[PDB]
Design a protein around this ligand. Structure first.
Ligand SMILES: C=CCO[C@]1(C(=O)O)C[C@@H](O)[C@@H](O)[C@@H]([C@H](O)CO[C@]2(C(=O)O)C[C@@H](O)[C@@H](O)[C@@H]([C@H](O)CO)O2)O1
Ligand SMILES: [Zn+2]
Lengths: 219, 222
C-alpha cells in the first residue's frame, strides 16, 4: 500500500545532455528513527539484470559514475544524469523499502543521435529448410536511426504482404542505432513458382528505397 | 566475488506448481535478508517477498499479489534461497530474480542474479530448427559482410545465440522473438570483415534449454 509512480514514462536525450527523471511515493519515505529516506534507484540495461545506482535517496553506490545523482525527500525524488552517454540507455526504476518494498513503473531512457541509413542484407531460404517444405526469406535492416522504418517485399516485381513478420532490436548501447529483421515465410511450392525476391527499405534518411534482391535461378 | 544464480525456470501448465532456487556465494549468507523480484517480458519489476536474516529469525513477508500462494525458504547450510510457486497463471510468466536485501543496516539490493524465465502455458515444448543465412555473392564485395542464423519454430523461450562460441561479440544483432501459432521465431546477424570470411569460419551456436537443444551451424558459402 505505498504506491510508486515515475515520470516520464520514456524520453530520448542526446549524448552530452542532462536528463531528469522523477519518482513519487503515495506516502513519505522519510524514516523518523534514522532520518533517511528509504528510496533506491536501479538501472536495467537491455537484456541485463537491474543494477543498484543510488540508495537512501542520494548515496551513490561505489563504482557508479559521478554523472548519476539522486535527490529529493519525503514523497518526491529524482535521478539526474549530468551528461548522458550512449551506454546510459536503460530503464530506470525507483524503489521504496520503508514498508516491505515496492518498485515504480520505470522510466525508459532512449538516446537521440544523428539520423543514419540502414545497411540492408537479404538471404534466401536454406536448402535444409527447403528440403523440409518451408521457405523463409530474411532481410536485415541494420544500424539505422531513428526507429521508424518501412519494409516492402516484392515477388517477381509484385508486392506481397502476407506472411511478413518484423522485429526491432532495442537500441544499441554503443552506437545508439536500431536494427530490424523482416522475415517472409512461404511454402516451398509457392517459393518455387517465382524467381525475383526483393526486400525494399524506406527510411527518412533517403527518398530512395534501399533495394536488395536475389533471383532463385541464380541460387 | 558475490555470486547469485537462479535456476528452475521453464514451462509449467496453468494451475501447476514450480519451485525456483537461488545459489549464492561470496558473502556471509545468514547476515542478509533475501528478496525475490519478477519481471513479465517487457514490463516493470515487481517485488514479491523476502526472508529475513538470522538476527531476525529468518521470518518471511510477501507482496499482496502473491501472499498465500508463493512460499520463500532458505538453506543456511548451503547458502541457498527458494521460491515455491503454486496455482500458476499466465500473469506469473516472468523472469524471476533473487537479490541480496537488508543486512539490518543498509537499505539496498546490492546484488542480483541473472534471472530465470518462467512461462505458464498449455503449449508443448518444441525444439528450434536452426538455419544458416549465407550472404549472396552480390553482398560479399564490400569491406564488411553480414551473415545470420534463423532459429525457427520453438517453444517456450528462451534460446541463446552466440557466434564462434562467443568470441565474435561485436557487430551482433539478435532480434527479439515473435510468437505465432504458439511457436517463436527469431534470427541473429553478425557482421564481420570480408577478410575473415569465408577464409576463417563463422558458426552460430544455438541453445534451447527447455528441450536441452544444442546446435552449431557453420555458415558456408553457397
Ligand atoms: C527500530 C526497531 C528496529 O530497528 C532494527 C533493529 O534495530 O533491530 C534495525 C532496522 O534497520 C530494521 O532492520 C528493524 C527491523 O528489523 C525491521 O526491518 C524491516 C523489516 O520489516 O524487517 C526491513 C527494513 O528494510 C525496513 O523496511 C524496516 C522498517 O524501516 C521498519 O523499521 O523494516 O530492526
Ligand atoms: Zn511478519
Amino acid at each position: 500500500d505505498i504506491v510508486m509512480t515515475q515520470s516520464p514514462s520514456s524520453l530520448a536525450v542526446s549524448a552530452g545532455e542532462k536528463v531528469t527523471m522523477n519518482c513519487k511515493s503515495s506516502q513519505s519515505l522519510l524514516n523518523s528513527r534514522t532520518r533517511k529516506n528509504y528510496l533506491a534507484w536501479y538501472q536495467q540495461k537491455p537484456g541485463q539484470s537491474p543494477k543498484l545506482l543510488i540508495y537512501w535517496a542520494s548515496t551513490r553506490e561505489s563504482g557508479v559514475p559521478d554523472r548519476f545523482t539522486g535527490s529529493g525527500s519525503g514523497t518526491d525524488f529524482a535521478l539526474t544524469i549530468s551528461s548522458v552517454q550512449a551506454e546510459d540507455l536503460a530503464v530506470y526504476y525507483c524503489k521504496q523499502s520503508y514498508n516491505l518494498r515496492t518498485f515504480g513503473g520505470g522510466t525508459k531512457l532512449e538516446i537521440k543521435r544523428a539520423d543514419a541509413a540502414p545497411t540492408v542484407s537479404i538471404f534466401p531460404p536454406s536448402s535444409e529448410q527447403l528440403t523440409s517444405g518451408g521457405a523463409s526469406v530474411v532481410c536485415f535492416l541494420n544500424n539505422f536511426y531513428p526507429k521508424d522504418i518501412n519494409v516492402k517485399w516484392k515477388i517477381d516485381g509484385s508486392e506481397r504482404a502476407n506472411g511478413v513478420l518484423n522485429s526491432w532490436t532495442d537500441q544499441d548501447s554503443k552506437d545508439s542505432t536500431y536494427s530490424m529483421t523482416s522475415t517472409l515465410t512461404l511454402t516451398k511450392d509457392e517459393y518455387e513458382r517465382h524467381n525475383s525476391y526483393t526486400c525494399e527499405a524506406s527510411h527518412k534518411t533517403s527518398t530512395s528505397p534501399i533495394v536488395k534482391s536475389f533471383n532463385r535461378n541464380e541460387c | 566475488e558475490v555470486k547469485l544464480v537462479e535456476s528452475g525456470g521453464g514451462l509449467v501448465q496453468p494451475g501447476g506448481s514450480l519451485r525456483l532456487a537461488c545459489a549464492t556465494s561470496g558473502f556471509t549468507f545468514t547476515d542478509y535478508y533475501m528478496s525475490w523480484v519478477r519481471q513479465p517480458p517487457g514490463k516493470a519489476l515487481e517485488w514479491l517477498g523476502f526472508i529475513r536474516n538470522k538476527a531476525k529469525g529468518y521470518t518471511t513477508e510477501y507482496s499482496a499479489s502473491v501472499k498465500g500462494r508463493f512460499t520463500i525458504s532458505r538453506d543456511n547450510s548451503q547458502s541457498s534461497l527458494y521460491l515455491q510457486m503454486n496455482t500458476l497463471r499466465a500473469e506469473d510468466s516472468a523472469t524471476y530474480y533473487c537479490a541480496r536485501d537488508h543486512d539490518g543496516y543498509y537499505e539496498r539490493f546490492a546484488y542480483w542474479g541473472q534471472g530465470t524465465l518462467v512461462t505458464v502455458s498449455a503449449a508443448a515444448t518444441t525444439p528450434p530448427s536452426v538455419y544458416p543465412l549465407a550472404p549472396g555473392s552480390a553482398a560479399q564485395t564490400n569491406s564488411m559482410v553480414t551473415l545470420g542464423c534463423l532459429v525457427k519454430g520453438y517453444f517456450p523461450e528462451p534460446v541463446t545465440v552466440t557466434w564462434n562460441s562467443g568470441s565474435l561479440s561485436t557487430g551482433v544483432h539478435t532480434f527479439p522473438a515473435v510468437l505465432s501459432s504458439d511457436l517463436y521465431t527469431l534470427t541473429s546477424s553478425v557482421t564481420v570483415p570480408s577478410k575473415t570470411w569465408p577464409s576463417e569460419t563463422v558458426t552460430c551456436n544455438v541453445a534451447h534449454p527447455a528441450s536441452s537443444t544444442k546446435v552449431d551451424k557453420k555458415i558456408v558459402p553457397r
